[PDB]
Design a protein around this ligand. Structure first.
Ligand SMILES: [Cl-]
Ligand SMILES: [Cl-]
Ligand SMILES: [Cl-]
Ligand SMILES: [Cl-]
Ligand SMILES: [Cl-]
Ligand SMILES: [Cl-]
Ligand SMILES: [Cl-]
Ligand SMILES: [Cl-]
Ligand SMILES: [Cl-]
Ligand SMILES: [Cl-]
Lengths: 53, 52, 53, 53, 52, 53
């Protein structure tokens, strides 16, 4: 498991704990934030996704 | 567990249980606080999270 | 079978006879109106859909 | 087999010979026009689809 | 058979054979007049028809 | 394996090492850049994609 960075279309930068995934129930992009909380965002709002080094 | 949905038009919706893609319509189906089944378009949902 | 109320993005309110469903051939949302007429609309034009009590 | 009418978002009205279908190769909406010619349009450009009576 | 593709930005593209959804990218894949494989987004295609 | 040129809607030109592909977990377009870095972008941001000769 490796951390990722998501750049959103509204100019935010989100660091994820592990690789984000399409949620099986909602079709949204599911991720765990740096505080361990599970969040979901719309794929259409994600501009770029890359593994953090 | 209850969830909070934030829409692109600025609404905050609390769901009873986790929302899911409706098998018939492809919309996001959820149960409101009163037990009624509602559907909204995924493209109108900005954020979705478990409520504390 | 139960009736539904559909709100479109152009501000219309449509009552359906039975639950709307994705048409297998076109991928559009198929429904029967209050007058028994079968229509299809695009999912992207549907804002809300809810069961009538 | 029955004829259909498509209303596009640019204000056109297209009568089809038979029911339009998602093309298996392209994912576009495939239809046969009133002159017997096979055409394809994008589903996103279709506002409403209904069988002609 | 050759096809004609009209895009939303006003381009007219002639393809060698019928275009198809690319299995890897989900884009519309086609072969140009010179035999080169190209891909465009379906959302940019307005019309697609067999060329006479 | 062959290199590709990707044109984005924001006017960028990206050369990829190998063919880009839809990521199985996120549904985004995964690619390796000229510097060997793995990135993911949204399909809706890709205007054109073509094989380099
Ligand atoms: Cl999941
Ligand atoms: Cl998407
Ligand atoms: Cl369902
Ligand atoms: Cl059907
Ligand atoms: Cl849709
Ligand atoms: Cl077909
Ligand atoms: Cl569509
Ligand atoms: Cl392919
Ligand atoms: Cl993958
Ligand atoms: Cl897409």
């Amino acid at each position: 498991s490796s951390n990722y960075v998501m750049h959103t279309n509204d100019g935010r930068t989100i660091v994820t704990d592990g690789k984000p995934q399409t949620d099986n129930d909602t079709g949204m992009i599911s991720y765990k934030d740096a505080w361990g909380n599970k969040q979901q965002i719309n794929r259409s709002d994600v501009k770029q996704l890359g593994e953090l080094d």
